[PDB]
Symmetry: C3
Subunit: 438 residues, 3 copies
């Protein structure tokens, strides 16, 4: 086996196809860095990265290659870093073997046993923090026979980011672990920032070309409903596996997962890669462009065209004139009818459509001496819950009704509804009577 140096490429670029009918020893040299970068216009963030970029450098090897993996951590790094590649068969995917303090180096070796497109990421405590700061990338293990040649290959990885400040707030934004743990992202992006791959930084192709996208999802947390606006995937390698799906509009990419999608571009214009959990795209930044140049094909698409729609919208909260006014019951008939709504929405699942309950389990509200003898017991049952021995129409019950957080109006109305149905005692209970039971 001859040794070769891996050619690593920054996103959105991909190394050339392997030019070997046989195995080699591949030497990889990757460094870990911590540095400030732009996350959106006017907003900065300390990105942690494999090789200077988020996602990290793309690695391309052949199934069966013997890999020497060298990780070096810059001395300016404050944290140790390591690597788990999903392409590795071995403990921690390399994590135990690549633990690298600032200024130091580690080396491990592995054979690439499985072809596919694999996420790699840092595996240093706090793991979610390292990953959330941008420490992820892709390694392609080509099948022995190689992949079909295509005209354009691009590398993108989606990530969710969590900042102390809100989206768009100017300044150097720190990581917010409270948001990250809650899975509540401020930014969702391809390739490390809002607008990383739009306008002059767009992916490019020409009419008639085949395009392949190597799409990863570094997470840490979110699952991508991955879609290209104005295109349909001719082929999807399902979850990056061997299975090929065709004619797919939108595919799910797991957190810590990847997929390969392919399509021929037949019409010129801008095609927009998004996470179709759609506020992530137009509000949080999960929007990249593929700009296709060449002659119109009016047999495929013809219409007015102007790049004045599908622009980024930001994350400010937009509101229309509010239409809501509180409604309260004014008389007994109205309490009964409002109460029926409360009953059917909240009580019926147990006590049933005609108040009959389920014998031995949920007692009847229909002709209930328990309720009729003191309607405030029905009020208390809702507010406080009801458990333990009770008697309803001389039948013993011993179940548990949960407390339910209904307001005074709803309780007053539902109890009034029940009292005026199913041969119960009639009368009514008011919201103020309920308030005083609290």
């Amino acid at each position: 086996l001859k040794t070769e140096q891996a050619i690593l490429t920054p996103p959105p670029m991909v190394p050339p196809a392997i030019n070997r009918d046989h195995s080699a020893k591949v030497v990889i040299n990757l460094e870990t860095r911590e540095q400030v970068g732009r996350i959106a216009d006017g907003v900065e963030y300390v990105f942690w990265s494999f090789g200077e970029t988020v996602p990290g450098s793309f690695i391309r090897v052949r199934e069966g290659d013997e890999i020497e993996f060298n990780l070096s951590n810059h001395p300016s790094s404050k944290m140790p870093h390591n690597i788990d590649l999903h392409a590795v068969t071995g403990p921690g995917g390399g994590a135990e073997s690549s633990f690298t303090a600032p200024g130091h180096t580690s080396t491990f070796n592995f054979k690439a046993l499985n072809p596919g497109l694999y996420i790699y990421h840092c595996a240093t405590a706090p793991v979610g923090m390292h990953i959330a700061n941008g420490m992820y990338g892709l390694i392609l293990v080509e099948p022995k026979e190689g992949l079909a040649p295509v005209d354009r290959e691009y590398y993108l990885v989606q990530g969710d980011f969590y900042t102390k400040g809100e989206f768009g707030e100017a300044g150097l934004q720190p990581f917010d672990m409270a948001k990250a743990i809650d899975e509540d992202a401020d930014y969702v992006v391809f390739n490390g920032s809002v607008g990383s791959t739009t306008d002059e930084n767009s992916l490019t192709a020409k009419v008639g070309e085949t395009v392949r996208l190597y799409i990863g999802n570094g997470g840490p947390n979110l699952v991508s409903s991955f879609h290209v606006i104005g295109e349909i995937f001719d082929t999807v390698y399902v979850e990056g596996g061997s299975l090929k799906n065709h004619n797919v509009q939108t595919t799910l990419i797991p957190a810590g997962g990847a997929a390969i999608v392919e399509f021929k571009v037949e019409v010129p214009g801008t095609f927009i890669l998004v996470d179709h959990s759609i506020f992530r795209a137009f509000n949080k930044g999960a929007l990249a462009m593929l700009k296709v140049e060449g002659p119109d094909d009016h047999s495929i698409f013809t219409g007015k065209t102007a790049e004045n729609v599908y622009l980024p919208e930001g994350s400010a909260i937009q509101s229309l004139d509010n239409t809501f006014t509180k409604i309260t019951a004014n008389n007994k008939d109205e309490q009964i009818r409002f109460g029926q709504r409360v009953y059917e929405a909240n009580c019926m699942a147990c006590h049933q459509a005609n108040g009959e309950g389920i014998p031995g389990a949920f007692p009847p509200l229909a002709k209930s001496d328990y309720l009729n003898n003191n309607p405030l017991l029905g009020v208390n049952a809702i507010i406080k819950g009801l458990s333990g021995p009770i008697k309803v129409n001389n039948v013993n019950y011993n179940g548990v009704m949960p407390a339910m957080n209904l307001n005074d109006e709803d309780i007053a109305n539902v109890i009034t509804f029940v009292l005026n149905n199913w041969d119960n005692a009639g009368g009514k209970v008011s919201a103020e009577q309920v308030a005083k039971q609290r």
Copy 2:
């Protein structure tokens, strides 16, 4: 090519199978509307829609058809509207070409190049708002050879809705973008409202029939774990693609995605379509019915039967009697043992099971002169974090320990635990000593 008028159907109905062995020019006329509708009993919402319904009218064409797409916006609309169909190969899926102010019309043309079941939706700023208000539907592009005939075809699309008020609050509810951006839905529904397709509005079939469901997910945000209670999918077209999976209980439908599922119904009764992220179904409204009529088959299923379970439950918070009481350490042995728990749960990932750390990266807590000489430094390290040059047992460290938001009791206990292990100095630190370090 002869021209034909597309027959558009409201949910849950589907147009008839294409009756052509060849291509046609298909003319579609679709209008956009804004109008109040019911979202749950007593609750109203301003739905924005393609053709009057949420989801919009179903469109059925054949692969290779030349489509003339006409969109008209009613003059009562306050907003412009447009359309992106996932079936279109072309910029914006038609969005740039169909931008239609109230009272106006737009026309574009496209060829349906890819067979499948495709989401369409509005693409007008604010995009998430337009989609969240109900502007989505499905277009079926039949394969040239057509689909197998089945006895029943139904159209459903799941959507997540975001209201200023809580679930079930009577009144005209406005859209809440703050909730939408956070992906925190008040309602999750099929076909535009809670109970849209239950009881008298159920889907129907007869024992022995084959049923096909065209199921979309308009989002905007949520991914559906789509399941039919009491049934198993005989076939799933994976993510709406060419790939067929069989014997699937539950399938993921991406936001802005779709799938076709098929099953033969062999037993009578009510079968319940749900999103199996299960609070969405029984609490938030993602519950539709397929009622199957015909003779029992006791060789397949026999049991007591009564439609008194799996009823809608509403979204009120139910609580059982609370069992929780705060626990604090009463003596040194107890502080040590409680501290061991805090240590193993929060500190060990770096400082290791026996306090040895990782040389050069995480300093030892075992026989730590740094801690033993002033235990309050350990307290401060947790409260404030610790970074920069330190010395531990004459070894230099320069790492960064994050601040960790542990309370006074937990800090006091973990520091006491460490002091009483690994040949450290003993003694203890109290919660009040920790409080005063803050």
Copy 3:
């Protein structure tokens, strides 16, 4: 048909392969229990379960078997319980037919028509609560020809849990429905607790063995990005269906869904099953171990090895020294430039890059007499929204601009930017002028 007793196994164990070339009548006896168990060290929780464990007992049958299902509810249970098995063709998956009050029993019969690995769970109101308390398990319906023999079979089910207290808080923790409805989990676990299947409770195998995992996701709410650290799935049965995917790093398991994954273990060490929405694994508890014993294979993996990484981290919030300082504009040129950022991030999607808008829909900001004549109208448009008839450069508009929740500084800056572009009137608006418009 001979009758046989189902052998039910507790997690992570699986019953032996069916030893029959033909159908049988299989009798299942399962009980429902409510009891306190550990959820994490020092933390207890009342688990509700089928047979004593979370997940419940594993059931293994053959396609075509006639099943008699007996459910018995212990008299110490406070709640009724029932069962919906996804393997059943019939109403409620058995739910209507198995409703069992404490001290009681129910029986129903069904034929297992579809092979696969199926979730079962409780279906008693409140359904989400019963499921969230641990009431789920798996039933395997073997295909008639059986599954390939493997060396190790293990049973795991992921669940999300919701407690009143925060992760790790000592005591008996009650279920928190408010968190559950919001899908905001405190714990995410395999097999019912943090550390259920780590250390001495790890899964085990030997180098060279084939391992099959029957992996379910009981939810109630979350979807698992299921991954085994240091391994690649040789085969995945997609969503538990007939379709086989190969060489998959991470697969999505739907809530109320399952999958079978297989891999040969070729290197010794600890391999870590996780949900790769990665904070769930290292912080919330979704971390199980498979420990593989045997000789090293240095041709596959060679590196330093020490089980000092990928340790559980707990859910305390960790923070690095905060780098953020608020920035405000000091002069007109700076207001203009800061305003350009606000403009491009929040306004451009409608009013366009050069302020031209879209004729008839979004009015121009370029040379806008409306704004130039009273810049405070631009301020008000943002704060309050703007709707109804207006006139811009003698052109009538009647659209609706949403209110947008921008702060005083951002509004002052964006209006100043607009005034100083596109032949507008110049001048400026200050943050204090904006404040007073509120």
